C-alpha cells in the first residue's frame, strides 16, 4: 500500500505542492517539501504577474467617428481595429496554451528533482521500486526519515546493515 508520483498525486498532501510519504516502525504520514514548494510558488506567482503586469498600454480612446461623406475612412478605422483584434486574440490564445504546457512540465521537473535527491542519498541502502518509492534496506527510524528529507542522510552510517539485508535478497 502507498505508492508515489509515478502513479499520480496525493489527496493527503495538503500543506505543500511537493512532498514525501513514509513508513517505518514508529508510523506513517505525509510531509511536504516546504522549501521546494516555496521556490515553485514564487516562480508561478512571478510568471502570472509578468504576463499580467507587462501589459503596459497607451491610453485607450473611443473617438473613432468620421463625417457622413468619409465612410472609407471609417472602414479604415474598422479594419485597423480588426487587425489588432486578430493579433491580440491569436497571441493570447497561444501564450496561454504554451505556458500551460510549460507550467505542467515545471511541476514534473520539480517532482523528479526531489526523487533524484532522495535516490542519490540512499544509493544502494535502498531499492528503487519504480513507482516513486524506495525500499530502505535497513531500519530507518523517524530521525532517519527526517535526515533523508533534510538532505543529511548518511550513506556510510547504514551501509553495513543494508549490505547484509541485500545479500539475503540475493
Amino acid at each position, epitope marked *: 500500500a502507498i505508492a508515489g508520483f509515478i502513479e499520480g498525486g496525493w489527496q493527503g498532501l*495538503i*500543506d*505543500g505542492w511537493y512532498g514525501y510519504h513514509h513508513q517505518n516502525s514508529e508510523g506513517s504520514g505525509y510531509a511536504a517539501d*516546504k522549501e521546494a514548494t*516555496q521556490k515553485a510558488v*514564487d516562480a508561478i506567482t512571478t510568471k502570472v504577474n509578468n504576463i499580467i503586469d507587462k501589459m503596459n498600454t497607451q491610453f485607450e480612446s473611443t473617438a473613432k467617428e468620421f463625417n457622413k461623406i468619409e465612410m472609407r475612412i471609417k472602414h479604415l478605422s474598422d479594419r485597423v481595429d480588426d487587425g489588432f483584434l486578430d493579433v491580440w486574440s491569436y497571441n493570447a490564445e497561444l501564450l496561454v496554451l504554451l505556458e500551460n504546457e510549460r507550467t505542467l512540465d515545471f511541476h514534473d521537473a520539480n517532482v523528479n528533482n526531489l526523487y533524484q535527491k532522495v535516490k542519490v542519498q540512499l544509493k544502494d541502502n535502498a531499492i528503487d521500486m519504480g513507482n516513486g518509492c524506495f525500499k530502505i534496506l535497513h531500519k530507518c527510524n523517524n530521525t532517519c526519515m527526517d535526515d533523508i528529507k533534510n538532505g543529511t542522510y548518511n550513506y556510510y552510517e547504514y551501509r553495513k546493515e543494508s549490505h547484509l539485508e541485500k545479500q539475503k535478497i540475493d
Partner: antibody, heavy 124, light 107 residues
Framework: QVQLVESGGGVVQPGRSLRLSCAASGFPFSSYGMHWVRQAPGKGLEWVAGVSYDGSYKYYADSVKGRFTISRDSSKSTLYLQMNSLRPEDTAVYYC??????????????????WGQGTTVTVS | EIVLTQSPSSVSASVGDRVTITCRATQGISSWLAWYQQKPGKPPKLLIFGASSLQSGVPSRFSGSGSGTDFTLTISSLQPEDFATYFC?????????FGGGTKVEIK
C-alpha cells in the same frame, strides 16, 4: 464567523507551569498549521512555537525550547501551549495565529491571517 | 536566524501624508514578507503578504514592494484610522521573525 479564542493566561510565580488553549471555529482547523506568537508589554512580536496540521512536526524558538510544548486536539478544534519553568521574561500577551494558505495549499510558513484577542501571562 | 531591521523606529505625520517604512533582512527571503497593523490592546492585522499582495478588505492606499533583502511599505494618503504600529514579518524559514516595529503618530 472565522476567529480564534485564547484562554488560560494569568498571574503565575516563577518556575510554575501553565497551559494555554486556542479554540478555533469557522474554518477547517485540522488543515492548517498553527503558531503561537507572544508580545511583551511595550515590546515587539516574538514567535515562540508552531505545529503542523497533523501535529507530527513541531517548531520552537530557542527562547522556549525544552520548556514549552505545542499540541493540538483535532476533535475539539483546539490548540495548546504547555508552558513549563516559567520565567519573568516569559511575561507577554500570547496569541495563536493561523498561517495563510495560498494556491489552495495550507503552507505553514506564510503570513498570519487570523489572530485572537490574546491572553495575558504575567510571571512575577 | 534571519533578523529584520525596521526603519524608522517611529515617525510623525499628518493626515494625507505619504509614509514610507522599510524592512531589511540579513539574507534573501524572496517574497515571504508580511506587514501587520496593530492598534493598542488589539491583535495584529494582516495588511500585506507576499511582500506586495493586498489582503482582502484592506484599502488600496496600502502598498508593499521589494524582493530578497529590502522591502518597503507605503501609505499613499494617511487616514485618521491609520495611526498605529506596523510590523514586518518574514515567512522564509523557521524561526519566524518580526521587525522591531514602527509607530505612526500625529505631529
Amino acid at each position: 464567523q472565522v476567529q480564534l479564542v485564547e484562554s488560560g493566561g494569568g498571574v503565575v510565580q516563577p518556575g510554575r507551569s501553565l497551559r494555554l488553549s486556542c479554540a478555533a471555529s469557522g474554518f477547517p482547523f485540522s488543515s492548517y498549521g498553527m503558531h503561537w506568537v507572544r508580545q511583551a508589554p511595550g515590546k515587539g512580536l516574538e514567535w515562540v512555537a508552531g505545529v503542523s496540521y497533523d501535529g507530527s512536526y513541531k517548531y520552537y524558538a530557542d527562547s522556549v525550547k525544552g520548556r514549552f510544548t505545542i499540541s493540538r486536539d483535532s476533535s475539539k478544534s483546539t490548540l495548546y501551549l504547555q508552558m513549563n519553568s516559567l520565567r519573568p521574561e516569559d511575561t507577554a500577551v500570547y496569541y495563536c495565529a493561523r498561517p495563510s494558505a495560498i494556491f489552495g495549499i495550507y503552507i505553514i510558513l506564510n503570513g498570519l491571517d487570523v489572530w485572537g484577542q490574546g491572553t495575558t501571562v504575567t510571571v512575577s | 536566524e534571519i533578523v529584520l531591521t525596521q526603519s524608522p523606529s517611529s515617525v510623525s505625520a499628518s493626515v494625507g501624508d505619504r509614509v514610507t517604512i522599510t524592512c531589511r533582512a540579513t539574507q534573501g527571503i524572496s517574497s515571504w514578507l508580511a506587514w501587520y497593523q496593530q492598534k493598542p490592546g488589539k491583535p495584529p492585522k494582516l495588511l500585506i503578504f507576499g511582500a506586495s499582495s493586498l489582503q482582502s478588505g484592506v484599502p488600496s492606499r496600502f502598498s508593499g514592494s521589494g524582493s530578497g533583502t529590502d522591502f518597503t511599505l507605503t501609505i499613499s494618503s494617511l487616514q485618521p484610522e491609520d495611526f498605529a504600529t506596523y510590523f514586518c514579518q518574514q515567512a522564509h524559514s523557521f524561526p519566524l521573525t518580526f521587525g522591531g516595529g514602527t509607530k505612526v503618530e500625529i505631529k
